[PDB]
Design a protein around this nucleic acid. Sequence first.
RNA 1: UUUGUCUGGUUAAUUCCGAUAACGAACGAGACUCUGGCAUGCUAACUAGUUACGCGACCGGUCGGCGUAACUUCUUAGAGGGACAAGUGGCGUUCAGCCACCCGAGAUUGAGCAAUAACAGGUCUGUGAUGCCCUUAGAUGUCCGGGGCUGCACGCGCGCUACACUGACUGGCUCAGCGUGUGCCUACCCUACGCCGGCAGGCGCGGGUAACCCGUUGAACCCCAUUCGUGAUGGGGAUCGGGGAUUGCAAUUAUUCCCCAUGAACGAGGAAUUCCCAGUAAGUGCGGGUCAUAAGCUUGCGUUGAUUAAGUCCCUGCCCUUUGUACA
Lengths: 98, 189, 70, 65, 56, 54, 140, 141, 138
Amino acid sequence: RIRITLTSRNVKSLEKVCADLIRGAKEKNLKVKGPVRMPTKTLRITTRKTPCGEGSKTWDRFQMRIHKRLIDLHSPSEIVKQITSISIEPGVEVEVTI
Amino acid sequence: DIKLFGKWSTDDVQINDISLQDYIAVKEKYAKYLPHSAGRYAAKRFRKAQCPIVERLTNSMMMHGRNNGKKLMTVRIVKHAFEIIHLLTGENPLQVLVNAIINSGPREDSTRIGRAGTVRRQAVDVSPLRRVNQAIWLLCTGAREAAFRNIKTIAECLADELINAAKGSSNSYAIKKKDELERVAKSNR
Amino acid sequence: LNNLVLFDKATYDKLCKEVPNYKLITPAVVSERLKIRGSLARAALQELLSKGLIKLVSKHRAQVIYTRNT
Amino acid sequence: GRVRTKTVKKAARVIIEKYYTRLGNDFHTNKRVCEEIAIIPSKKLRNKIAGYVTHLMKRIQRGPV
Amino acid sequence: QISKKRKFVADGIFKAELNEFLTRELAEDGYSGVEVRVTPTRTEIIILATRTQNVL
Amino acid sequence: GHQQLYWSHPRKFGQGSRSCRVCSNRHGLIRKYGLNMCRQCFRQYAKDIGFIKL
Amino acid sequence: LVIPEKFQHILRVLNTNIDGRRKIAFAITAIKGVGRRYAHVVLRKADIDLTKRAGELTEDEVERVITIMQNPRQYKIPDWFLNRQKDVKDGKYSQVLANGLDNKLREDLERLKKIRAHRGLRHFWGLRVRGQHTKTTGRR
Amino acid sequence: PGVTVKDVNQQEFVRALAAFLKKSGKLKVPEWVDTVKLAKHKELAPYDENWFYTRAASTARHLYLRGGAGVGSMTKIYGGRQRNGVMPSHFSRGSKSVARRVLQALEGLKMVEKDQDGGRKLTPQGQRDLDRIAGQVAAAN
Amino acid sequence: SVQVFGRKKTATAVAHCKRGNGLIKVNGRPLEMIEPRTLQYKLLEPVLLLGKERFAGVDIRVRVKGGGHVAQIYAIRQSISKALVAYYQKYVDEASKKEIKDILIQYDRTLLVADPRRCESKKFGGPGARARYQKSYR
RNA sequence: UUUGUCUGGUUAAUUCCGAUAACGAACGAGACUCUGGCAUGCUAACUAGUUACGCGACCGGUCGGCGUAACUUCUUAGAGGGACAAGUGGCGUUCAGCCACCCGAGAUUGAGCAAUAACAGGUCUGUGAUGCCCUUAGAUGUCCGGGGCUGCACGCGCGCUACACUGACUGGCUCAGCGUGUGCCUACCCUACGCCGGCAGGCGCGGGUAACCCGUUGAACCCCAUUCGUGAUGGGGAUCGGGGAUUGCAAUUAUUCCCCAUGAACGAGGAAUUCCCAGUAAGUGCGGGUCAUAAGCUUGCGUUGAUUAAGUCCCUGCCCUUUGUACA
Ligand SMILES: [Zn+2]
């Protein structure tokens, strides 16, 4: 019961590496339960635009999304080293616990 | 057999005017159980006319800012006021609302001209949907201002206001202001 | 407004001999013509339903409605 | 206001000069025609191009434009 | 330990201070930007420059 | 000076206990998520952290 | 519900005209040192039903209101209700009523005016006392 | 038919359970039930002096519907709106003294036990004592 | 057996409708036990409109969440009507579905068709979406 | 230097049609990104749920009550689909389009972005961005301590709370949603549950770096009964006294909170004027900010949810065309 946990700020690299990891685990046919899409946390900081406070008080709205996914599989726990060597694309980082 | 509030037949009441026949929506398609519809009706020109007349009546009682947004309070007020109509007069109350709105829309009115602040007014006549909603506004004034400071509560005052426009007594602020803002259009001619 | 706090001696024949001949009996009905408080209206017009000459038509926390029993 | 701008009624006409043997009077056929015959970025331009070639084929077969 | 949000923010502050310091030293080098790539054998930092001979 | 009264004031729990992590100012800070920058240094490096207007 | 022969149109108890036409716990609010939160536990401990008007009560229960009202600590009005819980001069636990709250008030005011502490000087000069801005507000 | 709390009108049932929690005489009444305010936002003591039995009645009904609750969730149920004078109004929590004393007094007549998770729940006996009262309001119309 | 939702707002109602001897229960309480009673006819509007014979084979259990009270009522009646029409299309013949849909749609279209209106966001410079602050000139 | 860029029609728009010494274009508008509205069609899952079961508890029903096997309706969120003035009737130099109505989730959802080029607009108090002038050791650096920005014969503006009976006060009942959560620098956190108090709180075992614990976020208004009865009254809770607790090195010029007491104008506001067109105004609460303590402000979230307009250049600004100049 080893669960690999993926996190990024963009959806497309995370979707490519999750598709590649389930393709590498469906080619060897371990039991893989599919990607479980955890809800996105928006970090929003709403600051004022003007550096001295003189104008017509227009406000500025920043945000950043965190996309949080996982794959869970039942296997021997040293077979699991060979799948996480194809997943080294930037953005997405991998946290593994048992 | 769609009955209003469970108890009111809509099959029998008499619109005695031609001009408001498509502009007081009370008859068989617009028979609904409740004065709440939660509608999308004021999203186009002339979809607000074929909102039911009872639904416009309970929404126009939401008017001042202490009572803004509160609909079921006026559903309760119009429920007890209709029961006050059935107990004080004992006729079908939908004829009382129809008679109040048909009788109290002012048929002639005045417009301001004179280039924005020298007063010479000109008389023209009123469109029937403007007559219907002007009648509901002159019926919801009166009753709130005549139950603002009184020992009388609102439901007797509103049902008596619809009675007092249904028979045309000149204590009725709908009928009193109807005669006044048509007689000044008589005067500026 | 100068209202009665409790009933006077010749108020009971007014309460019993005018009021069931009225068309609509609410707690806002008697106090205009009697100069009484509305607490007398609610308590006394509730007590007449045990005398059985009125019928309760509606009950609410703000508005109570009674009438003649024919 | 729903007026079509320069690209959705010039590009629709240069789509109509060639490829007239594929186009027709129904909107849902021409909407599916427009991706073999062009390279358009995203679909709201493509639905607007398809709406003008349907309106132009509604116009054109009864006289000269 | 530390949150996911505070980890992402603090790594963003690492990108900001690394690019600001590398601009403030390396005017002569043709410095345009930096590239981080992190594997746990060795954490790799790749500098973009047009002239390497002043980078060394 | 004396090292028993010089900077003896508590620099816990203060507006002088926190400052911008870039430009040494203490006013109009953004304290959330461990940024601790003032608002101007947020707006310079905003897309460099990844906070993007959308 | 008809007026009794023992109905009172006024009371003048503790030299304030209590109107006989009002309800009892709202008739007693003219005495400074009883408000309503004192009043409803006064008529709780004096064992009177609350429903009656001011004239409907006899004099014996009314004097039980006043006699239990003057020393409430004998009859388990509890200790956190009290008006002066520690006096400056006496140090007793007391609930001070109509004419004694006034005398203790102006003595504490004049004690503040004697000893050159801040608050009575702010009281004497015409200012707000408890730290308020009087730049824009409070103009007479 | 079979009559539980969830099938019946909830304006009479809490007052009939309050009539049972008066008429049994096995609910303890502590010494300060007649001088208290019931949170920091209310103005006055109750009109009816039977508020303790009514409050215990509704409290056992709330343990009928959702158990796994404690005092700190009983104050989240029993909060209200604070008028603050010239400031805006606020939501301010209910009192933990009344909920602690009501829930221990309902444990005193063997009607109420704690949960496995540390908060509270009903007994089978306290389940029985409420479904019978729902069965007895069920005939009164 | 169907379960089919209805929504007005962030209030969401879904009725669980399977075969039986007649039932309506909204979160374990029946339809005559919901708190707002000036709006009592809105939940009863398929019961008054279709008649109790049209419900004569089903056990409908409604579970609601979210929103306010009135939006919850308007999701209850829509979920009930969609429950009966989804049962009628799967298990009864479609002319009965045609009869029930013209008797339900022509009265009120919120009984079968949802509400696309949601609350529009506040923007700066004013306390609501459209309203703006008081803007003294002098 | 001009025409291209206009008499006119049309458009939210120099958006287009049309006229035509102009023909084809570029920036801005539009397109585009993000969000909202649809899916029994796909992918689906003990940090998410439905339901057929198995058992427990209560008089077939109820159980957020305890654990298992199939599904993806409800939760999450990706890949594509979808609405285009496309279908019809009318108006229309039969051309731009405009209006009406079905089928439809939807027939102007909202924000970001933002051209040529200019103002002596604001900011040297965001800057280890700064040019020069200044001071530079009886300092205008720098620290520690009391004081100050809070003062009031007085104006002007943003706001809050109300002037009550659609109300007030007391009990009951039942529902959200955006999000926050143990920290390089550095002490500063969300709080379950049990015991003790009428409160702020005191005390202890727990959980949590988060769809897991607070949290089914048991929110307010709204709803249902009690009392009050037009009174400056039980509305108004301003000002003003004694006491208890919390934070902190320290609360006086009361920081905050609660107990009791006190009951000021105010009864709906005159000339001028501010804001607004559908989930809109408004009523009502809840999160974020600042924060050792914390919101009458600001930034968002939802909830209850309307009257009135579907237009004009009268007013106020602004752009454009023709016209006058000794103004640049
Ligand atoms: Zn910043």
